[PDB]
Amino acid sequence: SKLIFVSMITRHGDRAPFANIENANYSWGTELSELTPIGMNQEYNLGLQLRKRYIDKFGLLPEHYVDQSIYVLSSHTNRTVVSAQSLLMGLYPAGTGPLIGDGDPAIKDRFQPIPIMTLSADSRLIQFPYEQYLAVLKKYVYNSPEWQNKTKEAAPNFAKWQQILGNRISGLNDVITVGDVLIVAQAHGKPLPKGLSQEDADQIIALTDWGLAQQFKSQKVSYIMGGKLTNRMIEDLNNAVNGKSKYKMTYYSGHDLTLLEVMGTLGVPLDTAPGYASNLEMELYKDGDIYTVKLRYNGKYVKLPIMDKNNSCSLDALNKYMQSINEKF
Amino acid sequence: SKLIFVSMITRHGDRAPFANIENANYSWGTELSELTPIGMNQEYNLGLQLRKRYIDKFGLLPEHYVDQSIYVLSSHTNRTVVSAQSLLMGLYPAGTGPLIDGDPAIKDRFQPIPIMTLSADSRLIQFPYEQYLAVLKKYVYNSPEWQNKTKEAAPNFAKWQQILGNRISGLNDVITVGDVLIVAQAHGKPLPKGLSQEDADQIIALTDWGLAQQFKSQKVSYIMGGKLTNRMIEDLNNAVNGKSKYKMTYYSGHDLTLLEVMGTLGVPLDTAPGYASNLEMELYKDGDIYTVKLRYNGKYVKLPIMDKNNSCSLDALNKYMQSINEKF
């Protein structure tokens, strides 16, 4: 049996936050929302790992980039485009890029350009538009029993956290908001805000992780946001078999929500929010007329309900499974 | 006076053709329509030149890339995206990328710089093909200049058609096969059997002529290029009015992109843009006074509104553009 195609999603790398904690004076060294050098490195290193897997180990892809062999599509953000470019600098590193004339590099250090397309800012494929995302949350998530129950558990801390941080804290949505800043701060080794104990920070961050993952424990929420991309990836698998496409890999450069919504759509929602450079791969194998699929998330195979002891299923089975999900929603 | 902002358009680099000459067996080593290694190199070298100009000479941009300092937008094609990436590899080369104790974020200190792409149906940088041909049919193919040149060339159509195998029944078809001959020449391929160098030269010369001729019409130029021309001037204004902090906006495009903007501004090119051709709108500040210069392929261009020094005020450029708009 031979690996013949892979479709991949990544979360982007380490970034600055989007917002600030009112009562702190963090300086990030990069603009709000932008990928940091740490984030570029994380994606670059994932790219190196993917080269070891899909080039060295499986030989799905060649050592030197073949034009039109990989389709890369990113959401319309600097951080996801730069993450994809960084990853590709690991997948096809300096030294492997094309030569011209008599073995002279097309680009110094034999860099390999690989085209990245971006969706429009209003595309819902990879990143659901923010106001629409919040609307989905308000409608399906915020008033759900799990959300309400967790809210009551955490609510006794809101006044304190609010006075400490200066930011409004009147619900879990606000905790998630400031929680991101605390996550970035920790990732960059910043001190805690004055008066925020490590214990309090840990609680906020844990609620943030919980909140993000909880949203997609609903297959309906996952499908609303993620059904389009999930269908598309499965269609990519099919196009590798039906002769409609010659790509060896399709790669969607996205966000934590992108991973959460696809995993959630497939009925295997994540228990923890994806860390930086988390990634998912749908692998298609061929043994004669038999086609089998495996699903890999952060380095480990994932067992869909339809898969066997070996974390595998026929492509036909995956298709039927997806068809039923579609009919369900 | 200090340079404070630049808006730039490029044509992409050397590429394979889009179609084949029927009676030839060329092998490009690159998929049809894709940028070649030669093309990556051309854009990379343009990037190096732009570093020497806008970083080293004018100091508009710093030696190490600053996030959100340059906005890059490409048409929805591999060749224009790869061209922009290659150029940026020259503008901010290996060795200048970020560190994470002085260890490179990416091996060889590569510098990623984000590139956004328009949708395939955007008309900003590349007019959609069918719509483009419709504009040509409507405004260009039946124009007197086009008809007259067609009559000059027509006595050769039968010969060229039998030689090449491709249909040749008008200048549009000459332009079509002409591109293949241009690529073949750029890659040192032999001539198709039975096509003399003289014939090849005529076809290529007609191709260059035809592409430029389309945009000698300011109306055609405006239909296709008015939107981008306005956007670039708006970029200049946003550098002054505080709305934008970009030092440069860069539109990665095609020969038509350059032709349509130049044609819109009333300075249509006489020659079709070669690979990695480029245009820059430069904005200068001397105190409260703002001046603009227009550079195409390394040389300043004199708009009708410009003075002896190939310069005009930004106010003048705005008024000039406003009139063009009102005109169309």
mmCIF file of N, CA, C and O in Angstrom, chain A residues 17-61:
data_model
loop_
_atom_site.group_PDB
_atom_site.id
_atom_site.type_symbol
_atom_site.label_atom_id
_atom_site.label_comp_id
_atom_site.label_asym_id
_atom_site.label_seq_id
_atom_site.Cartn_x
_atom_site.Cartn_y
_atom_site.Cartn_z
ATOM 1 N N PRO A 17 -0.858 39.264 20.613
ATOM 2 C CA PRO A 17 -2.304 39.196 20.835
ATOM 3 C C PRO A 17 -3.037 40.194 19.922
ATOM 4 O O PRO A 17 -2.392 40.939 19.173
ATOM 5 N N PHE A 18 -4.361 40.216 20.006
ATOM 6 C CA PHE A 18 -5.180 41.198 19.290
ATOM 7 C C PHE A 18 -5.548 42.363 20.168
ATOM 8 O O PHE A 18 -5.838 43.449 19.685
ATOM 9 N N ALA A 19 -5.558 42.117 21.465
ATOM 10 C CA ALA A 19 -6.027 43.116 22.411
ATOM 11 C C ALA A 19 -4.998 43.277 23.511
ATOM 12 O O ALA A 19 -4.051 42.508 23.612
ATOM 13 N N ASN A 20 -5.170 44.287 24.347
ATOM 14 C CA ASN A 20 -4.254 44.412 25.459
ATOM 15 C C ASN A 20 -4.964 44.340 26.797
ATOM 16 O O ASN A 20 -6.154 44.628 26.904
ATOM 17 N N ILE A 21 -4.227 43.894 27.803
ATOM 18 C CA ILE A 21 -4.704 43.952 29.176
ATOM 19 C C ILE A 21 -4.497 45.366 29.672
ATOM 20 O O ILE A 21 -3.389 45.900 29.618
ATOM 21 N N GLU A 22 -5.589 45.995 30.096
ATOM 22 C CA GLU A 22 -5.563 47.424 30.401
ATOM 23 C C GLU A 22 -4.517 47.778 31.442
ATOM 24 O O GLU A 22 -3.842 48.812 31.347
ATOM 25 N N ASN A 23 -4.376 46.910 32.435
ATOM 26 C CA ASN A 23 -3.545 47.237 33.591
ATOM 27 C C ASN A 23 -2.127 46.672 33.478
ATOM 28 O O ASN A 23 -1.359 46.699 34.436
ATOM 29 N N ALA A 24 -1.776 46.168 32.296
ATOM 30 C CA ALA A 24 -0.404 45.749 32.039
ATOM 31 C C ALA A 24 0.261 46.628 30.973
ATOM 32 O O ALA A 24 -0.419 47.303 30.204
ATOM 33 N N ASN A 25 1.590 46.619 30.935
ATOM 34 C CA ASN A 25 2.335 47.322 29.892
ATOM 35 C C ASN A 25 3.256 46.392 29.122
ATOM 36 O O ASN A 25 4.472 46.607 29.059
ATOM 37 N N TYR A 26 2.680 45.346 28.545
ATOM 38 C CA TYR A 26 3.463 44.421 27.754
ATOM 39 C C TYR A 26 3.904 45.096 26.459
ATOM 40 O O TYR A 26 3.130 45.809 25.830
ATOM 41 N N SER A 27 5.149 44.879 26.064
ATOM 42 C CA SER A 27 5.551 45.264 24.717
ATOM 43 C C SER A 27 6.035 44.015 23.990
ATOM 44 O O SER A 27 6.981 43.356 24.425
ATOM 45 N N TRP A 28 5.380 43.695 22.878
ATOM 46 C CA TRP A 28 5.586 42.414 22.218
ATOM 47 C C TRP A 28 6.785 42.314 21.274
ATOM 48 O O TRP A 28 7.305 41.216 21.035
ATOM 49 N N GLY A 29 7.223 43.445 20.732
ATOM 50 C CA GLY A 29 8.266 43.417 19.724
ATOM 51 C C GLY A 29 7.736 43.085 18.337
ATOM 52 O O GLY A 29 8.492 43.096 17.358
ATOM 53 N N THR A 30 6.447 42.759 18.253
ATOM 54 C CA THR A 30 5.755 42.641 16.953
ATOM 55 C C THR A 30 4.368 43.288 17.070
ATOM 56 O O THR A 30 3.837 43.430 18.179
ATOM 57 N N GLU A 31 3.826 43.741 15.945
ATOM 58 C CA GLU A 31 2.524 44.399 15.919
ATOM 59 C C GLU A 31 1.423 43.465 16.378
ATOM 60 O O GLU A 31 1.481 42.272 16.111
ATOM 61 N N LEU A 32 0.396 44.015 17.027
ATOM 62 C CA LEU A 32 -0.750 43.175 17.396
ATOM 63 C C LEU A 32 -1.228 42.393 16.189
ATOM 64 O O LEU A 32 -1.234 42.914 15.076
ATOM 65 N N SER A 33 -1.619 41.142 16.434
ATOM 66 C CA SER A 33 -2.134 40.191 15.426
ATOM 67 C C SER A 33 -1.082 39.507 14.547
ATOM 68 O O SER A 33 -1.389 38.516 13.878
ATOM 69 N N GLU A 34 0.139 40.025 14.520
ATOM 70 C CA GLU A 34 1.122 39.515 13.564
ATOM 71 C C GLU A 34 1.835 38.274 14.092
ATOM 72 O O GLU A 34 1.974 38.093 15.304
ATOM 73 N N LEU A 35 2.301 37.426 13.177
ATOM 74 C CA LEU A 35 3.098 36.272 13.569
ATOM 75 C C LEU A 35 4.453 36.747 14.088
ATOM 76 O O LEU A 35 5.058 37.648 13.506
ATOM 77 N N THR A 36 4.942 36.130 15.162
ATOM 78 C CA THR A 36 6.248 36.517 15.714
ATOM 79 C C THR A 36 7.347 35.686 15.062
ATOM 80 O O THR A 36 7.061 34.708 14.362
ATOM 81 N N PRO A 37 8.613 36.075 15.283
ATOM 82 C CA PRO A 37 9.713 35.216 14.831
ATOM 83 C C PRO A 37 9.571 33.805 15.415
ATOM 84 O O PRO A 37 9.852 32.820 14.709
ATOM 85 N N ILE A 38 9.117 33.701 16.667
ATOM 86 C CA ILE A 38 8.880 32.389 17.274
ATOM 87 C C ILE A 38 7.859 31.587 16.453
ATOM 88 O O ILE A 38 8.041 30.380 16.201
ATOM 89 N N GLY A 39 6.804 32.264 16.013
ATOM 90 C CA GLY A 39 5.790 31.636 15.176
ATOM 91 C C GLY A 39 6.318 31.167 13.816
ATOM 92 O O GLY A 39 5.931 30.099 13.335
ATOM 93 N N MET A 40 7.182 31.964 13.188
ATOM 94 C CA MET A 40 7.799 31.584 11.915
ATOM 95 C C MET A 40 8.621 30.312 12.114
ATOM 96 O O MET A 40 8.579 29.390 11.298
ATOM 97 N N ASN A 41 9.372 30.291 13.211
ATOM 98 C CA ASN A 41 10.219 29.151 13.554
ATOM 99 C C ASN A 41 9.405 27.878 13.789
ATOM 100 O O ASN A 41 9.793 26.781 13.365
ATOM 101 N N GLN A 42 8.276 28.024 14.475
ATOM 102 C CA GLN A 42 7.430 26.881 14.763
ATOM 103 C C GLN A 42 6.914 26.268 13.467
ATOM 104 O O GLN A 42 6.888 25.048 13.304
ATOM 105 N N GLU A 43 6.510 27.119 12.544
ATOM 106 C CA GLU A 43 5.961 26.613 11.279
ATOM 107 C C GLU A 43 7.063 26.044 10.398
ATOM 108 O O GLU A 43 6.889 24.991 9.762
ATOM 109 N N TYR A 44 8.200 26.728 10.371
ATOM 110 C CA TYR A 44 9.379 26.246 9.659
ATOM 111 C C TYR A 44 9.738 24.848 10.161
ATOM 112 O O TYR A 44 9.926 23.929 9.377
ATOM 113 N N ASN A 45 9.790 24.677 11.476
ATOM 114 C CA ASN A 45 10.115 23.367 12.028
ATOM 115 C C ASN A 45 9.060 22.300 11.720
ATOM 116 O O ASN A 45 9.411 21.146 11.496
ATOM 117 N N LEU A 46 7.789 22.686 11.672
ATOM 118 C CA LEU A 46 6.749 21.743 11.248
ATOM 119 C C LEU A 46 7.010 21.331 9.798
ATOM 120 O O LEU A 46 6.895 20.147 9.441
ATOM 121 N N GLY A 47 7.377 22.303 8.971
ATOM 122 C CA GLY A 47 7.715 22.018 7.576
ATOM 123 C C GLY A 47 8.841 20.997 7.448
ATOM 124 O O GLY A 47 8.751 20.062 6.641
ATOM 125 N N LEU A 48 9.897 21.170 8.243
ATOM 126 C CA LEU A 48 10.997 20.194 8.273
ATOM 127 C C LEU A 48 10.492 18.801 8.628
ATOM 128 O O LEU A 48 10.919 17.809 8.036
ATOM 129 N N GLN A 49 9.602 18.729 9.614
ATOM 130 C CA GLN A 49 9.049 17.451 10.073
ATOM 131 C C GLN A 49 8.205 16.798 8.982
ATOM 132 O O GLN A 49 8.241 15.573 8.787
ATOM 133 N N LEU A 50 7.441 17.620 8.274
ATOM 134 C CA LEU A 50 6.621 17.127 7.167
ATOM 135 C C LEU A 50 7.463 16.630 5.997
ATOM 136 O O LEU A 50 7.063 15.704 5.292
ATOM 137 N N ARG A 51 8.611 17.264 5.772
ATOM 138 C CA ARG A 51 9.563 16.774 4.775
ATOM 139 C C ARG A 51 10.053 15.384 5.188
ATOM 140 O O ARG A 51 10.118 14.468 4.373
ATOM 141 N N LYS A 52 10.386 15.215 6.462
ATOM 142 C CA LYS A 52 10.880 13.917 6.909
ATOM 143 C C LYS A 52 9.814 12.843 6.747
ATOM 144 O O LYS A 52 10.121 11.677 6.469
ATOM 145 N N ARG A 53 8.555 13.236 6.897
ATOM 146 C CA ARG A 53 7.461 12.282 6.798
ATOM 147 C C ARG A 53 7.042 12.012 5.353
ATOM 148 O O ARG A 53 7.103 10.874 4.879
ATOM 149 N N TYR A 54 6.641 13.065 4.650
ATOM 150 C CA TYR A 54 6.014 12.888 3.336
ATOM 151 C C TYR A 54 6.976 12.833 2.173
ATOM 152 O O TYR A 54 6.609 12.393 1.085
ATOM 153 N N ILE A 55 8.207 13.267 2.395
ATOM 154 C CA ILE A 55 9.236 13.134 1.372
ATOM 155 C C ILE A 55 10.162 11.969 1.711
ATOM 156 O O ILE A 55 10.225 10.983 0.969
ATOM 157 N N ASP A 56 10.851 12.050 2.847
ATOM 158 C CA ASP A 56 11.822 11.008 3.194
ATOM 159 C C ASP A 56 11.215 9.636 3.466
ATOM 160 O O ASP A 56 11.708 8.627 2.948
ATOM 161 N N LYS A 57 10.167 9.594 4.284
ATOM 162 C CA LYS A 57 9.621 8.334 4.768
ATOM 163 C C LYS A 57 8.648 7.694 3.776
ATOM 164 O O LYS A 57 8.807 6.526 3.407
ATOM 165 N N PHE A 58 7.648 8.456 3.345
ATOM 166 C CA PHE A 58 6.628 7.932 2.433
ATOM 167 C C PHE A 58 6.942 8.158 0.954
ATOM 168 O O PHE A 58 6.383 7.471 0.095
ATOM 169 N N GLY A 59 7.816 9.121 0.651
ATOM 170 C CA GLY A 59 8.144 9.430 -0.729
ATOM 171 C C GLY A 59 6.934 9.824 -1.562
ATOM 172 O O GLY A 59 6.926 9.659 -2.788
ATOM 173 N N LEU A 60 5.900 10.336 -0.901
ATOM 174 C CA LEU A 60 4.757 10.886 -1.618
ATOM 175 C C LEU A 60 5.229 12.040 -2.492
ATOM 176 O O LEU A 60 4.893 12.120 -3.682
ATOM 177 N N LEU A 61 6.024 12.924 -1.889
ATOM 178 C CA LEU A 61 6.537 14.121 -2.551
ATOM 179 C C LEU A 61 8.029 13.980 -2.846
ATOM 180 O O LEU A 61 8.755 13.317 -2.103
#
